[PDB]
Design a protein around this ligand. Structure first.
Ligand SMILES: [Zn+2]
Ligand SMILES: [Zn+2]
Ligand SMILES: [Zn+2]
Lengths: 698, 698
């Protein structure tokens, strides 16, 4: 059911865990470096887990997709055919940006963080800067030992701070991927849908140097030896059984003010969806003409289609459950309860009023700020502004540089500058520049930016067309020229005639002022959010309820049971799909073109010892009332005993309004059953040596 | 499961009956005039049943629709509002044509029927004439007792004959009908559909004279006092429970030869569906520009549209289960098994080959036969041919008149000629004449009819115009003129210069010849069909299977269990719907506009003591694997103890092939739960006097 629990609080919900069917102790699963949770690793946007003592890792197929594609050629197309490395020497590099993060140490630093913050006083901007300086020093000390990357997380609006130290593994290799018509069966048609029949898995192996320390790719590297790895369930997973997921959910907003919900539902989501559908259409149209565009902008357009449809999907969800009235009523209950407290309820009511004040301030400039951020996020302007800003930060001592522009960030910046070549074509980027400038000049007069108005020299189509002609002269389209600017001094930026640079130099004082205004507001938030969130927690507790923090990229556990749902009277989604359902969907055409070996194996009922008699077949995917969101792709599903029964890979469409509210009736995770992994690797695209490594050989 | 069993054979399926959960003895339910099967009555078209010892009858709302309409005005709309009679003196006549038939006596006449047929020797036409004569005198002698109507039914190709003598009750009155948004909730949108939420029921009362004998409506009549009547269940109906239906299915063709079925699927269905769509388009377009056309041809066009959709639906459903291949393989198994026997198998193989040959004969003239039938069934041509044929049959004595033209048929004939006024406009009939003459002039020369060619005088567009212009002069438009011809003698027909009667005189010798050809073939089928069906039954017995005759309007029992179905992997239709499901569909516009007392009672959860806790609500409708077809509307559904738990009113769209096949996975009957009858009558449109009469209220 609902809840993204921090592992440290699982002992306080022993009652619900046990009732749902947990057989390990709460204490055992609260150990973030223990068995099983110490097997869970972060890939940087997806979850994965160790599944052998020789560093084999399992995750979703769409999580490995970049690595599979990276190693594919026209005549050896691994996306379509699959990949298998029968020995560890056959494994292929997932590329210099691939990472496995293994948790080494967690520290609660809440006391020192709150002291660093209090020492700043009444000044909001200085509160933000104190916390920045606190965080930077923490990270720098923690990372002084090579091989580790550290992160500071704020929980519950700044009620709690914890510091995570992770081993940063940098040699990650592909070991297995099923054919793409397994890993992505149903493609975009089945996305967010149940019934689901998708074998969404792939395997990596993690490598380090012979000295046991992380290293970049080298033939001299050997597999990492994890301290904990998951084992396949020996018990067949059935309807009603306990399941739990561990992983790194990104962001939820379950505790937001009602007017914060309203502003999102009424403005943010429709504005963004509209813009993204506009951009999607121009890219789709242009890509039909020019296959270079289509290739290079495909990941980009897919990103847009995702968010755009998630937001149409949340919008729709909000209507179905009347999210607006639900928030207003809940907040009315909380505010009435606080009035009923003393004197001692006042600080939280003042905090509430302040948060509404901050929201009003952000709203006054919201068109200006979004349109300017997205204009500047086009490829050449994003690059020029980012490179000029780095040049400005390089004049400061490293400890004072902005996050994102410190020494420790340089490789990721250099990496981004190269990677841009894979997703940039001038004629397309000009069309996006154009769109955004057209949106800009449509802004009301009080939403404008003086620097941009001066640079344009007017507020009409003619000024737009002049600006595009001016900008077309940039050289920042070559990787080689971007890397020159990466190394360049700010005087060089400020003397340049490159028109993308001159735009950056012209706007940057403005960007810094808007940044400083964001940070002032954030400093106020830092004072008021935690006070309000604590009162929410006390209110919930007075009503008998447990509380969990909104997602914030750190490790969480969610639990529940395997179960379908009923979207209307007279019908039910059943909790499992089966092999024969995969074959009923076959059309012989992408995306419903299963490998022949799969069709043959199902026609023959080669169940390979894996069938569950209760469903009459080998299960494919299953539903459960777990609570996940972006970031949880590739999370292991564990049973009551902490054994692997699945990977998370999606949710139902009704789930996506989850971010704001959690609808217990309808919200379900979709997982791929561990038996289906085993079945594919036995009967369809075989990997007997991996199954042997995981002690599930025939 | 599959089977439309005659009651006499139930003892021989004691095993399967008991296994499905029947608790009465098969012997008890085998008695057609017994408890409970004697309570089941025929309305003509529809099934109903007695539910009190004072003649109360329950059937479907759509079975009672004609009576509700008859008793409605513009100002008092019983269709919309419902009807309730608080005392029996309030009940209103269903009109002079309304009938309840109650079985009085059944006699097996197989021996005498087969003797009459055998006396004709090897003369095929004389075999047909011998059965006709046997039937006509058996029915006349049975019916010489006033008050009774008799039918002779042939079973299994003529392997068995039974005579049914029914009490013919003629004073039938409406006692209760729920409001139309209950009786037909979801209208044509929810036709054939599950989930379903329709309260498809209504009540009549049957009346007889004070002497106990049938009589037409009179205020001196009293309620009929049935020998047997049904009681409401007292055990709550749940999923998996035994249910059985008793009713009068019209016709099935489950044992059609492979080639017969192939001809129907490949030629008959697509060809009729084509003509029907063309006629539909012609009436749609004409009705726009008229409104008399539009109103008078609505039902006709509906009926075409229905058959058209059902034929297309059956073709798709045939492909979905490979009906043709299953039939070919079972037929092959039969022929194999006969072939292995000696001489012993030869008669049945010979009869098979004879049935193939008769199919070939009818195939040779299929185009001509269909075109000529449908040309002659246009309204004026239909009227003229029928009336002239009647005049020919008159002037034989009644005992020799072809059935459909005897004295006992003259009320249905008179009926037809008046009713025609409801559905005839000359401008439209002309177009339908035109369509069919244009079909006709496409016939090959060897498919032509000389007498039609002569009358046409030509074979091109101008011939057809002359003919239509000619036919337009008829006077058979007017109901009064048709009634003249209905009483005129053969000689008046043959002098008349009414152009439609002239057409009929010209074509009638040909029609008669063709009738004689059909009867010759029917005579050959008399001899070959039962011999093949007997071999079919013998083969089946060798396989451990029981065989039921095709439906033929006699009383049949089907049995099985309440269960849903899964049309695809990952989902299920559940066996019941609930009250809350009704309200979730509310839009309040027709046809999703429930009465307000319904919305209010569901919102208050006034379940009236009727809720089944296993579903959390009062049941509305439910699914089961019973085998029904047209004729079964209104059939009572009984539980393991022979107590009433619902009425059959529809099937899922997978039932649309009930003539040809049963699919045990998908075919389901849809019934209204007797608890929903009761709930409506308690909480929504109250009828406390009927509930008390049925011993389920005070
Ligand atoms: Zn530990
Ligand atoms: Zn800063
Ligand atoms: Zn005859």
């Amino acid at each position: 059911g609902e809840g993204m629990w921090v592992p440290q609080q699982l002992p306080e919900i022993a009652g619900p865990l046990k009732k749902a069917g947990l057989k390990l102790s709460p204490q055992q699963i609260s150990d973030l470096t223990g068995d099983p949770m110490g097997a869970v690793v972060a890939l940087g946007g997806c979850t994965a887990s160790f599944v052998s003592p020789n560093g084999l890792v399992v995750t979703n197929h769409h999580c490995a997709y970049g690595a599979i594609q990276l190693n594919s050629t026209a005549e050896n197309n691994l996306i379509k055919n699959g990949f298998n490395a029968p020995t560890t020497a056959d494994e292929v590099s997932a590329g210099p940006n691939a990472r496995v993060f293994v948790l080494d140490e967690i520290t609660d630093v809440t006391k020192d963080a709150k002291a660093a913050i209090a020492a700043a006083g009444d000044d909001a901007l200085a509160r933000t800067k104190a916390l920045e300086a606190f965080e930077k020093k923490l990270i720098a000390d923690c990372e002084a030992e090579a091989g580790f990357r550290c992160r500071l997380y704020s929980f519950s609006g700044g009620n709690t701070y914890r510091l995570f130290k992770n081993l940063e593994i940098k040699d990650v290799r592909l070991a297995y991927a099923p054919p793409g018509s397994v890993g992505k069966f149903g493609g975009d048609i089945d996305n967010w849908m149940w019934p689901r029949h998708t074998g969404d898995f792939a395997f990596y192996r993690a490598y380090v140097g012979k000295d046991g320390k992380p290293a970049a790719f080298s033939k001299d590297n050997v597999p990492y030896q994890p301290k904990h790895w998951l084992k396949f369930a020996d018990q067949p997973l059935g309807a009603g059984d306990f399941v739990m997921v561990a992983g790194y959910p990104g962001s939820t907003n379950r505790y937001a003010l009602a007017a914060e919900f309203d502003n999102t539902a009424q403005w943010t989501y429709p504005t963004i969806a509209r813009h993204y559908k506009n951009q999607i259409a121009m890219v789709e149209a242009a890509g039909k003409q020019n296959a270079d565009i289509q290739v290079k902008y495909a990941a980009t357009m897919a990103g847009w289609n995702n968010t755009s449809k998630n937001y149409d999907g949340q919008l729709e969800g909000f209507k179905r459950i009347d999210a607006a009235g639900q928030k207003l009523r809940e907040e009315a209950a909380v505010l009435g309860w606080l009035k009923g407290q003393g004197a001692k309820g006042q600080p939280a009511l003042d905090a509430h009023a302040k948060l509404l004040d901050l929201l009003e301030q952000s709203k006054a400039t919201r068109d200006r700020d979004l349109t300017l951020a997205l204009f500047n996020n086009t490829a050449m302007l994003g690059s020029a502004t980012q490179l000029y800003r780095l040049s400005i930060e390089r004049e400061k001592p490293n400890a004072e540089r902005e996050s994102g522009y410190q020494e420790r960030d340089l490789p990721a910046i250099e990496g981004g500058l190269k990677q841009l070549e894979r997703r940039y074509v001038a004629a397309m980027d000009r069309q996006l520049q154009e769109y955004w400038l057209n949106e800009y000049i449509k802004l009301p007069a009080d939403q404008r930016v003086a620097a941009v108005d001066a640079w344009l020299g007017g507020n009409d189509a003619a000024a737009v067309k002049r600006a595009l002609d001016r900008l077309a002269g940039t050289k920042l389209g070559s990787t080689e020229e971007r890397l020159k600017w990466f190394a360049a001094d700010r005087k060089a930026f400020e003397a340049s005639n490159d028109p993308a640079i001159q735009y950056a130099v012209a706007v940057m004082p403005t960007l810094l002022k808007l940044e400083q205004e964001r940070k002032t507001r954030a400093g106020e938030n830092l004072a008021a959010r935690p006070v309000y969130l604590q009162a929410l927690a006390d209110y919930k507790k007075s009503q008998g309820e447990f509380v969990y923090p909104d997602a914030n990229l750190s490790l969480r556990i969610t639990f529940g049971n395997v179960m379908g749902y009923a979207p209307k009277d007279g019908m039910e989604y059943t909790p499992f799909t089966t092999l024969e359902g995969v074959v009923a969907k076959e059309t012989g055409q992408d995306p419903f073109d299963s490998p022949k070996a799969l069709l043959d194996a199902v026609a023959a009922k080669r169940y390979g010892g894996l069938e569950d008699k209760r469903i009459g077949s080998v299960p494919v995917n299953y539903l459960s009332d777990l609570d996940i969101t972006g970031g949880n792709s590739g999370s292991p599903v564990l049973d009551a005993h902490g054994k692997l029964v699945g990977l998370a890979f999606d949710g139902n469409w009704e789930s996506v309004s989850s971010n704001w509210v959690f609808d217990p009736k309808m919200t379900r995770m979709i997982a791929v059953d561990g038996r289906y992994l085993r079945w594919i690797m036995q009967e369809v695209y075989p990997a007997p040596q991996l199954l042997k490594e995981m002690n599930v050989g025939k």
